[PDB]
Amino acid sequence: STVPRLHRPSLQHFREQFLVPGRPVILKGVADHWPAMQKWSLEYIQEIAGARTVPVEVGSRYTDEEWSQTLMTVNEFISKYIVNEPRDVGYLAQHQLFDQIPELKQDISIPDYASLGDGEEEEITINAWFGPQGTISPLHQDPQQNFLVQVMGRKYIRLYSPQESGALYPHDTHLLHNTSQVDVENPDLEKFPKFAKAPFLSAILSPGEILFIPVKYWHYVRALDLSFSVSFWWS
């Protein structure tokens, strides 16, 4: 089934109907006027920080377990993995562009819906990153509440509740813990028969929209276009 969409709901409505019971929802009209929506482009990023060095994870396939960390400039990442056709797959490690490019911080705002949490102020972790069309983030479980905001490009997202964990064949990976062994969009049901019967929610997230991913929900993502995302994590 699909993720419900709400237009600028009251803080109390979001808290009681979605945050407390742990139900996913897409909030509209909340981030659509961030300056980032009208400013961020590859050109803008390169004008500010193209010469700055960022950590990049490189691997053979988005769904493989072989990943090594490297260091390259923003310009080099864009040239090798976005402008030209790469020989492998790469993504920005840790998704923390705000460390190397603090100038971007002024172009966003923390959604007020995140201060409904028991941890506020410096306890909100904020990540920003961009990546080429086709970037896949394998199905994995999140230890904190999450807002995912699309600035550029569309993303396909699939969500499973923690109640379905057993059907997702979890294991720990060198990169992160609580990852599914299943290829969400082309599952091998001979090896993973329970996956077929797990219900899920899915949506295509577009620029300006915020997806609320409740704590311990499982989520899978694929970038359908060149993508720029911002995520907020809190307890």
Residue numbers in the entry: 182 to 416
From the manuscript:
JMJD5 is a JmjC domain-containing protein, present in both the nucleus and the cytoplasm. Building from an extensive peptide-based screen for potential JMJD5 substrates, our results provide evidence that JMJD5 is a JmjC-hydroxylase, catalysing the stereoselective C-3 hydroxylation of arginyl residues in sequences from proteins involved in chromatin stability (RCCD1) and translation (RPS6). Consistent with previous reports, JMJD5 residues 174–416 fold into mixed helical and β-strand topology comprising seven α-helices, 13 β-strands and 3 310 helices. Like most 2OG-oxygenases, the JMJD5 active site contains a metal centre, which is octahedrally coordinated by an HXD..H motif (H321 and D323/βII, H400/βVII), the 2OG oxalyl group and a water molecule, which is likely replaced by a dioxygen during catalysis.
Except in the apo-JMJD5 structure, the βIV–βV loop, which is involved in substrate binding in other JmjC-hydroxylases including FIH37 and ycfDs30, adopts a partial helical conformation in all JMJD5 structures. However, in the apo-JMJD5 structure, part of the βIV–βV loop (aa 351–361) adopts a hairpin conformation. In the succinate complex, part of the β3–β4 loop (aa 241–248) is disordered, whereas in the apo-JMJD5 structure the β3–β4 loop, together with βIV–βV loop, encloses the active site entirely. Compared to Complex 1, single sidechain conformations for the target arginine residues corresponding to 'productive' (A in Complex 1) and 'non-productive' (B in Complex 1) orientations were observed in Complexes 3/4 and 2/5, respectively. Comparisons of the substrate complexes with those containing 2OG and of apo-JMJD5 imply 'induced fit' on substrate binding involving substantial conformational changes in two loops and multiple active site residues.
